[PDB]
Structures are given as structure tokens and as C-alpha cells.
Design an enzyme around this catalytic site. Structure first.
Site, PDB file in Angstrom:
ATOM      1  N   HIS A 119      -0.487  -4.268  -1.244  1.00 32.44           N
ATOM      2  CA  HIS A 119      -0.544  -5.632  -0.734  1.00 32.44           C
ATOM      3  C   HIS A 119      -0.139  -6.658  -1.806  1.00 32.44           C
ATOM      4  O   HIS A 119       0.729  -7.501  -1.573  1.00 32.44           O
ATOM      5  CB  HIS A 119      -1.963  -5.909  -0.196  1.00 32.44           C
ATOM      6  CG  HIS A 119      -2.185  -7.320   0.255  1.00 32.44           C
ATOM      7  ND1 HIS A 119      -2.212  -7.682   1.584  1.00 32.44           N
ATOM      8  CD2 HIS A 119      -2.396  -8.458  -0.448  1.00 32.44           C
ATOM      9  CE1 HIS A 119      -2.421  -8.984   1.677  1.00 32.44           C
ATOM     10  NE2 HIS A 119      -2.529  -9.478   0.461  1.00 32.44           N
ATOM     11  N   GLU A 120      -0.774  -6.588  -2.970  1.00 33.24           N
ATOM     12  CA  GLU A 120      -0.484  -7.532  -4.058  1.00 33.24           C
ATOM     13  C   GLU A 120       0.934  -7.412  -4.611  1.00 33.24           C
ATOM     14  O   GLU A 120       1.555  -8.418  -4.973  1.00 33.24           O
ATOM     15  CB  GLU A 120      -1.501  -7.389  -5.196  1.00 33.24           C
ATOM     16  CG  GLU A 120      -2.912  -7.794  -4.809  1.00 33.24           C
ATOM     17  CD  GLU A 120      -2.998  -9.196  -4.213  1.00 33.24           C
ATOM     18  OE1 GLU A 120      -2.194 -10.065  -4.616  1.00 33.24           O
ATOM     19  OE2 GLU A 120      -3.872  -9.429  -3.343  1.00 33.24           O
ATOM     20  N   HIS A 123       3.189  -9.598  -2.729  1.00 32.21           N
ATOM     21  CA  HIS A 123       3.250 -10.946  -3.299  1.00 32.21           C
ATOM     22  C   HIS A 123       4.134 -11.012  -4.537  1.00 32.21           C
ATOM     23  O   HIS A 123       4.924 -11.945  -4.688  1.00 32.21           O
ATOM     24  CB  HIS A 123       1.849 -11.474  -3.637  1.00 32.21           C
ATOM     25  CG  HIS A 123       0.996 -11.724  -2.435  1.00 32.21           C
ATOM     26  ND1 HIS A 123       1.463 -12.386  -1.319  1.00 32.21           N
ATOM     27  CD2 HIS A 123      -0.300 -11.419  -2.179  1.00 32.21           C
ATOM     28  CE1 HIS A 123       0.493 -12.478  -0.428  1.00 32.21           C
ATOM     29  NE2 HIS A 123      -0.590 -11.905  -0.925  1.00 32.21           N
ATOM     30  N   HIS A 129       1.346 -14.129   3.029  1.00 34.09           N
ATOM     31  CA  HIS A 129       0.478 -13.546   4.049  1.00 34.09           C
ATOM     32  C   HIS A 129       1.050 -13.577   5.458  1.00 34.09           C
ATOM     33  O   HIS A 129       1.748 -14.516   5.840  1.00 34.09           O
ATOM     34  CB  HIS A 129      -0.895 -14.218   4.030  1.00 34.09           C
ATOM     35  CG  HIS A 129      -1.714 -13.822   2.848  1.00 34.09           C
ATOM     36  ND1 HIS A 129      -2.408 -14.729   2.080  1.00 34.09           N
ATOM     37  CD2 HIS A 129      -1.911 -12.612   2.276  1.00 34.09           C
ATOM     38  CE1 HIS A 129      -3.014 -14.090   1.095  1.00 34.09           C
ATOM     39  NE2 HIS A 129      -2.724 -12.805   1.188  1.00 34.09           N
TER      40      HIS A 129
HETATM   41  O1  LIG Z   1      -3.276   7.286   0.246  1.00 38.35           O
HETATM   42  C1  LIG Z   1      -4.240   6.494   0.439  1.00 38.35           C
HETATM   43  O2  LIG Z   1      -5.073   6.116  -0.420  1.00 38.35           O
HETATM   44  C2  LIG Z   1      -4.397   5.967   1.809  1.00 38.35           C
HETATM   45  C3  LIG Z   1      -4.130   6.803   2.869  1.00 38.35           C
HETATM   46  C4  LIG Z   1      -4.266   6.339   4.158  1.00 38.35           C
HETATM   47  C5  LIG Z   1      -4.659   5.043   4.408  1.00 38.35           C
HETATM   48  C6  LIG Z   1      -4.776   4.622   5.838  1.00 38.35           C
HETATM   49  N1  LIG Z   1      -4.904   3.186   5.970  1.00 38.35           N
HETATM   50  N2  LIG Z   1      -6.116   2.631   5.954  1.00 38.35           N
HETATM   51  N3  LIG Z   1      -5.860   1.339   6.081  1.00 38.35           N
HETATM   52  C7  LIG Z   1      -4.502   1.195   6.158  1.00 38.35           C
HETATM   53  C8  LIG Z   1      -3.889  -0.105   6.237  1.00 38.35           C
HETATM   54  C9  LIG Z   1      -2.586  -0.287   6.648  1.00 38.35           C
HETATM   55  C10 LIG Z   1      -2.074  -1.566   6.620  1.00 38.35           C
HETATM   56  N4  LIG Z   1      -2.744  -2.660   6.227  1.00 38.35           N
HETATM   57  C11 LIG Z   1      -4.012  -2.445   5.851  1.00 38.35           C
HETATM   58  C12 LIG Z   1      -4.803  -3.608   5.386  1.00 38.35           C
HETATM   59  O3  LIG Z   1      -5.995  -3.499   5.133  1.00 38.35           O
HETATM   60  N5  LIG Z   1      -4.063  -4.746   5.208  1.00 38.35           N
HETATM   61  C13 LIG Z   1      -4.653  -5.967   4.705  1.00 38.35           C
HETATM   62  C14 LIG Z   1      -4.986  -5.955   3.252  1.00 38.35           C
HETATM   63  C15 LIG Z   1      -4.829  -4.827   2.463  1.00 38.35           C
HETATM   64  C16 LIG Z   1      -5.151  -4.849   1.124  1.00 38.35           C
HETATM   65  C17 LIG Z   1      -5.637  -6.000   0.541  1.00 38.35           C
HETATM   66  C18 LIG Z   1      -5.786  -7.114   1.338  1.00 38.35           C
HETATM   67  F1  LIG Z   1      -6.247  -8.246   0.800  1.00 38.35           F
HETATM   68  C19 LIG Z   1      -5.466  -7.108   2.676  1.00 38.35           C
HETATM   69  C20 LIG Z   1      -4.614  -1.206   5.830  1.00 38.35           C
HETATM   70  N6  LIG Z   1      -3.849   2.358   6.083  1.00 38.35           N
HETATM   71  C21 LIG Z   1      -4.919   4.206   3.342  1.00 38.35           C
HETATM   72  C22 LIG Z   1      -4.793   4.667   2.048  1.00 38.35           C
HETATM   73 ZN   LIG Z   2      -2.737 -11.468  -0.297  1.00 42.78          ZN
END
Ligand SMILES: O=C(O)c1ccc(Cn2nnc(-c3ccnc(C(=O)NCc4cccc(F)c4)c3)n2)cc1
Ligand SMILES: [Zn+2]
Ligand SMILES: [Ca+2]
Ligand SMILES: [Ca+2]
Ligand SMILES: [Ca+2]
Ligand SMILES: [Zn+2]
Length: 163
Positions: A119-120, A123, A129
Site C-alpha cells: 500500500h505505502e 504512495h 487513496h
Molecule cells: O502473502 C501475504 O502475506 C498475504 C497473502 C494473502 C493476503 C490476502 N489478503 N488479505 N487482505 C488482502 C487485501 C487485498 C487488498 N487490499 C487490502 C487492504 O487491506 N487494503 C487497504 C490497506 C492495506 C494496507 C494498509 C492500508 F492502510 C490500507 C487487503 N489480501 C494478504 C497477505
Molecule cells: Zn495510504
């Protein structure tokens, strides 16, 4: 003469990064793997490549800090703000800071470092966002708990409009 570009993005395709320090929550190795995975998300959908530096000034300087850590984006303890990054440019452009008052993990527990880094680094590359709650670039962390990570289409279109 020369002029600044409107629309912040990198003009060079081979970018460097450096992990300046490490969270206690993970192995050096686990942190290196997480950031490498996070960069691969973006190199797989663009012509950008990312190389890691052990010393010196890199395009993307990565560090961990708590509370006030040397800029106008102070962290706030556990939860709330997890990290932030500066947009593309010289000086601090591209740098990514992670709140070391989070519990960082390679799992569904606490905050997944790879995910927040993905995510970062968005940016860092010039994405803002998204309003789509399914998007990687949605401002709120929401672990879906799927088996594998897939970059949602919203973020692909965004990154493709830049690179
Ligand atoms: O290899 C790994 O460590 C792994 C494997 C599978 C998944 C499955 N997965 N869980 N959540 C997501 C996912 C997919 C897309 N967006 C987000 C999400 O949470 N976005 C917003 C966000 C993310 C990070 C920081 C932030 F501020 C906002 C989460 N994918 C996540 C991580
Ligand atoms: Zn952000
Ligand atoms: Ca920099
Ligand atoms: Ca925080
Ligand atoms: Ca910690
Ligand atoms: Zn910062």
C-alpha cells in the site's frame, strides 16, 4: 531552461531502496522478504524494477519509528496510522515510514507488513487513496483473509495511468 512536471511520478524505471532499520517483531529476513514481495506487486504490473541498497542514499528510504520521528506525520501508538510515504521526487520523495508501535507480522494477526508495504509503496510511486473499499489503496486496512494476494483492478488502472 527547464520546468517541473505536473503529475508526480518517477521518470527512471530502475529504482533503489534501502531498509534503514528493522522492527523487533520480525526477523531481518522476514522483513526483507516482505518488502521484496511488496515491490514485486508493482514491478509485475509496470516496467519499474526495484533494487536493494545496503548503504548510501536510495530513492526509497524505508524506516521504522514511533510518535515523532522527523517529519510532519507523527505516528500515534497502536492502530490508527500504520505507516505513511512521500510521493515521487528528490530529497524525501519515495521514503516509506512504518509505525513501530504496531505488531508487524507475516500473517492475519496484527498488521501484515507485506500488505501495508504494498500500500505505502503505492504512495511512493504516486498513487493516492482510492474510494473503493476493496482496493489496495483504500485508506483503511482490511485483511480479506484470502489464501493468496491479488492486486485489485482499481489499483492496476491507477498505476497504469502513471507508468
Ligand atoms: O502473502 C501475504 O502475506 C498475504 C497473502 C494473502 C493476503 C490476502 N489478503 N488479505 N487482505 C488482502 C487485501 C487485498 C487488498 N487490499 C487490502 C487492504 O487491506 N487494503 C487497504 C490497506 C492495506 C494496507 C494498509 C492500508 F492502510 C490500507 C487487503 N489480501 C494478504 C497477505
Ligand atoms: Zn495510504
Ligand atoms: Ca529518497
Ligand atoms: Ca499507529
Ligand atoms: Ca513493534
Ligand atoms: Zn514519517
Amino acid at each position: 531552461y527547464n520546468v517541473f512536471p505536473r503529475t508526480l511520478k518517477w521518470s527512471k524505471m530502475n529504482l533503489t531502496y534501502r531498509i534503514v532499520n528493522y522492527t523487533p517483531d520480525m526477523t531481518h529476513s522476514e522483513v526483507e522478504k516482505a518488502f521484496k514481495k511488496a515491490f514485486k506487486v508493482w514491478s509485475d504490473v509496470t516496467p519499474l524494477n526495484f533494487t536493494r541498497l545496503h548503504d548510501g542514499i536510495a530513492d526509497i528510504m524505508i524506516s521504522f519509528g514511533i510518535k515523532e520521528h522527523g517529519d510532519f506525520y507523527p505516528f500515534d501508538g497502536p492502530s490508527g496510522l500504520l505507516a505513511h510515504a512521500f510521493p515521487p521526487g528528490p530529497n524525501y520523495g519515495g521514503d516509506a515510514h512504518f509505525d513501530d508501535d504496531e505488531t508487524w507480522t507475516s500473517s492475519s494477526k496484527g498488521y501484515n507488513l507485506f500488505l501495508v508495504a504494498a500500500h505505502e509503496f503505492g504512495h511512493s510511486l504516486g498513487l493516492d487513496h482510492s474510494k473503493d473499499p476493496g482496493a489496495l489503496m483504500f485508506p483503511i486496512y482490511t485483511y480479506t483473509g484470502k489464501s493468496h494476494f491479488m492486486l485489485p483492478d482499481d489499483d492496476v488502472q491507477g498505476i497504469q495511468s502513471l507508468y
